[PDB]
């Protein structure tokens, strides 16, 4: 024909008039990655690798089904602490083993919990036995759990 | 070459060896360009000065085989239905075939005998009608075109004291369009010359390469969009 | 839309599948083609000498008019199920001004 | 090709947009260009020097078929209604047809007999009227144009002692415009040659491609707007 | 083409296919350019050397139809009102028509008989008046232009012993202006040639395309503003 | 060279990639180009002016060997099945072979004897049929093509009072396509001239190199995509 | 005055109405036109491509 | 014609001599917005 134009993708840009858009950016992108991840594909558009489910096996090996809606998490060192609502108001402790999460149910009762008041937590490691997780709702008293 | 071959091989030539490197033509556009290319090829190879060899219809074996499948022989029909006015007193109006492109031989069968028709120009008519006798030679008849409505009407000026019993016309038939797909399937009501369906080439396979190459050149010129290219390849439209 | 790109499947190159749609539109036009590649017949997408080249679609309203405007949005995408890593380096757009 | 086709392959060969959101190249402008192209083609093909082959109206079979749909034979009507003044004593004023483009043959039927008309130039009138006899040759008559009002009036200088009974004129009819669509639909009160409705081409299909190509060239050269292109493609307006 | 068609079609050619891409001309400017273009076209197609074909007024059928609606026949009126002084003893001063552009045939009706007038140059007059007899040939008369006031005055030097009873002049009438609107409506007191209202073309439609194209070329040159373009297209002003 | 070789030295002289991971230049496109090259070579070498030496079919030993594998002798079959209309009273319609490219010798065996056929042009038919006798010379017969349907039909105008027994035709057979590989294997329903299988070249090995070089030139010029190259290498398509 | 511009009406393009006046002036001149667009006739404002 | 000039609108500027004005700015504007608001019309003049 007559003319050409080359387009590189340094990022994703919006908010700019179409007449004055910059060819170095993409106007809109779905499920792409421009940084080199798992391969040397930096400054080159590349895919998003998917997720892989991790079974929640109890220490005895049986499956552990989580009750309901999650309100907040907390990773202390390698223990993930979930505060979930549902039929009851539960607390879990998940430790990542090689291929599964060794799930424990630290509590299952009526800690008044609401979905309108999610959880925010701080967790400290004092020693092998005193591993605390302080958490607060916007509604209820501040609480602690070892 | 079937129509499918004309379409597939247009892209081995127009589209940078089927690389999708050039602009990309629909099938309607390819059909239009092929029809125009075949009309151009016919017109150029008919006139000796229109081609590169200086050779016309019957000037070489190749030219004879080129127009072999267009040459048709048909009879003219007396136009006695319409009582029009003729420029010559002894002119019998005859209507020519509808699918007529170029006439190359005409003959009239009179009571005196067959007489080869000479298509006489407007200057020669005035020159030959300024003389004492004002009749053709013993073995010929004249022909001039007259008032024509959606057809071709010819005045046959044969010598007086003679009656016309027949009128044979050998001519080049109008080529049919080249269409590579059912145009109505994707394009609403587009026709090339009034036909919306697949139409093959009614020509000898010898000039199919010529027609395809001319179509490719026309496509490249129409897409380069330069005025210079358009006017340059417009020279060969005649 | 000339563009370099490569799809892999566990260290195996796949020279047949890169993208599955090309939506091109502006204020008054919108066209889209599936980007198929038939080796013998012409197709919207053709590869040769390791470069992909796709004919930009034509307007849905007429199906004949090319995308003619001062600017235009060009969108490449895959919408067919598949699990490949598809490195997409860059893309050149050929226009006629 | 019909009007819809003319528009369609004009769009194909020019790369315009049929949509109205982008105005593109609309139907009125295309009709104007196709018209101008058809008068240009007629003028260039009638004059042998206007084309590339050097062949005029009846200089080859193609040219005979080109003007075939335009040839018309009509009589001249006496202009005795208006008592004007003639430049010759023995001149009978006759009015020519209104839709007249070019006269190629004229003949007058007198009591002495049919006599071919010679359109005599202004120089030859003085030259032959500066001699003793001052009459045409036995089998010819003269013709010089005279005072005309919204028509063409011609003085028929036939030999004295003779009367004119008929005056036949074989002429090329004025081409009708090529109008792709009813202009009044969108374009309020525009016209092309006084017509506003759909006007199919009145010519043989053989020159439809020539007209389309010439119209495309004119479109490209006008849209470019360069003075140089305008002057070069104005040379082919005659 | 009505005036409305000349204006609308100027913009399909001057204004980059009615795109408002070129400068933009008022209707007064378009009228001025059309009038100048028609004067230029008349002057060029009259002189054979002024056009591209080398053909003058009566050198082809096209030229005959071009000037068909300008040719007028009028009588000269004896200029006995003003007792001026003639350069020749036997010269009868005659005034010519006011709307006169170019003379092509003149005849004088004497008691001896009609005599074709030869417009004699100033060199031939001195050459022929250095001889014994000093009279025209038996079938001709001379003509030289004399003192003229706001008109055209001609001395008719016919042979002595003869009286002039008539003087017929066949000439090309001065074309009327081309005006596309009532100029007084928006432009105060501007006239093209003394007429401020809509004025149609008094010419055959055959040269309307020529006039429009010349107007477009003149507009493009006058707006490109180059001295070179102006002097180049000023060549064809004659 | 066989098909595998044609592909292999095409790859060597063009620098394509045999691998399919990079598509490279595939076998269908190479077959198409080799075909087009072989018809181009045949057409250019038959016409003396088409090549660089100025030597035609039988103008040197090399040219005689070039077309040697294409020369075929076959008889024409009477077309009495269809009762069509002939342009001559004494014309017997004969059908020619289907795989016909160019006719170089024709002869008819009559009761009087074998008579060489002269393919008589459309002008010479009128010229020789405007004479008293209107029959060929003693040892020749005429031939003019007539209405043909998916074949070539020829009118054999032999002298009256004679009957036609045989009609031999020595002609150049239509070349078969050069197909490097079975197209149906990968390419669904593509064809080259109605063939899909492997088609070895039917020509002498002497012009195999010419065909390969011409195909390589066409490949390079098409892949370049320049209009100028396409027009220049289209000149050698005839 | 060549210019690109677009008028919308709730996600609907309007290819007929962009501007309604153009006042151009300097120390000694002042002109103004309404910027109408008549498809057939010449007008102060014309759109194409 | 002969020459052209392109005008962008990065803002509204005044107070500068007309001979030395900058084509990137507008001398005076009424009810316009040059920042992208409710749409991606940044550095393009748009309505209020």
UniProtKB/Swiss-Prot annotation, chains B, D, E, F:
Annotated organism of origin: Bacteroides phage crAss001
Function: Forms the tail multi-ring barrel with ring protein 1, ring protein 2 and ring protein 3.
Domain of life: Viruses
Assembly with partners or alone: Homododecamer.
Further information: The barrel is composed of five stacked dodecameric ring structures. Rings 4 and 5 are both composed of gp34. Podoviridae-like phages usually possess only one such ring. The tail is thus rather long.
Protein name: Ring protein 4/5
Cellular compartments annotated: Virion
Entry keyword annotation includes Kinase: no
Curated annotation (Swiss-Prot), chain C:
Disulphide-bonded residues: none
Cited function: Forms the muzzle assembly at the distal part of the tail. May serve as the gatekeeper to control the ejection of the cargo proteins.
Shown chain mapped onto the complete sequence: 1275 to 1371 of 1371
Subcellular location as annotated: Virion
Complex formation: Homohexamer.
Protein name: Muzzle protein
Swiss-Prot record, chain H:
Localization (cell): Virion
Superkingdom field: Viruses
Assembly description: Homohexamer.
Known function: Forms the muzzle assembly at the distal part of the tail. May serve as the gatekeeper to control the ejection of the cargo proteins.
Name this polypeptide is given: Muzzle protein
Organism: Bacteroides phage crAss001
């Amino acid at each position: 024909a007559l003319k050409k134009e080359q387009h590189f993708f340094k990022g994703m840009q919006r908010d700019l008039s179409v007449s004055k858009f910059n060819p170095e950016y993409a106007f809109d992108a779905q499920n792409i990655r421009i940084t080199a991840r798992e391969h040397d594909t930096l400054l080159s558009v590349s895919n998003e690798k998917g997720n892989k489910e991790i079974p929640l096996q109890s220490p005895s090996g049986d499956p552990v089904v989580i009750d309901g809606v999650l309100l907040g998490q907390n990773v202390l060192n390698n223990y993930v602490t979930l505060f979930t609502k549902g039929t009851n108001d539960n607390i879990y402790r998940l430790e990542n083993k090689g291929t599964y999460f060794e799930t424990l149910i630290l509590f299952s009762g009526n800690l008044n919990f609401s979905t309108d008041y999610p959880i925010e937590s701080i967790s400290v490691y004092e020693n092998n036995n005193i591993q605390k997780v302080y958490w607060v709702d916007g509604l209820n008293q501040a609480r602690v759990i070892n | 070459m079937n129509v499918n071959e004309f379409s597939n091989e247009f892209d081995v030539l127009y589209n940078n060896i089927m690389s999708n490197a050039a602009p990309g033509l629909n099938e309607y556009e390819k059909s239009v360009l092929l029809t125009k290319a075949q009309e151009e090829i016919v017109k150029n190879y008919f006139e000796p000065a229109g081609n590169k060899y200086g050779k016309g219809l019957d000037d070489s074996p190749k030219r004879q085989i080129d127009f072999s499948e267009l040459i048709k022989v048909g009879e003219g029909v007396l136009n006695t239905s319409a009582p029009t006015i003729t420029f010559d007193k002894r002119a019998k109006v005859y209507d020519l075939p509808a699918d007529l492109f170029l006439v190359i031989n005409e003959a009239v069968d009179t009571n005196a005998g067959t007489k080869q028709i000479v298509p006489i120009s407007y200057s020669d008519y005035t020159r030959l009608m300024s003389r004492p006798y004002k009749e053709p030679v013993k073995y010929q008849a004249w022909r001039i075109i007259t008032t024509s409505i959606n057809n071709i009407s010819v005045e046959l000026i044969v010598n007086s004291n003679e009656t016309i019993t027949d009128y044979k016309v050998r001519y080049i038939r109008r080529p049919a369009p080249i269409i590579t797909t059912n145009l109505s399937s994707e394009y609403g009501d587009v026709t090339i010359n009034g036909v919306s369906t697949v139409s093959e080439c009614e020509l000898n396979p010898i000039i199919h390469s010529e027609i395809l190459q001319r179509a490719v050149e026309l496509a490249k010129a129409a897409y380069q969009g330069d005025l210079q290219a358009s006017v340059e390849l417009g020279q060969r439209s005649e | 839309v000339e563009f370099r790109a490569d799809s892999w499947d566990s260290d195996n190159l796949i020279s047949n599948k890169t993208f599955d749609t090309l939506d091109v539109w502006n204020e008054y036009q919108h066209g889209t083609t599936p980007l198929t590649n038939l080796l013998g017949h012409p197709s919207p997408l053709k590869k040769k000498f390791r470069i992909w080249r796709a004919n930009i679609p034509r307007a849905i309203a007429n199906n004949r008019d090319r995308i003619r405007n001062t600017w235009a949005y060009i969108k490449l995408g895959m919408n067919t199920p598949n699990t490949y890593r598809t490195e997409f380096h860059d893309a050149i757009i050929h226009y006629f001004a």
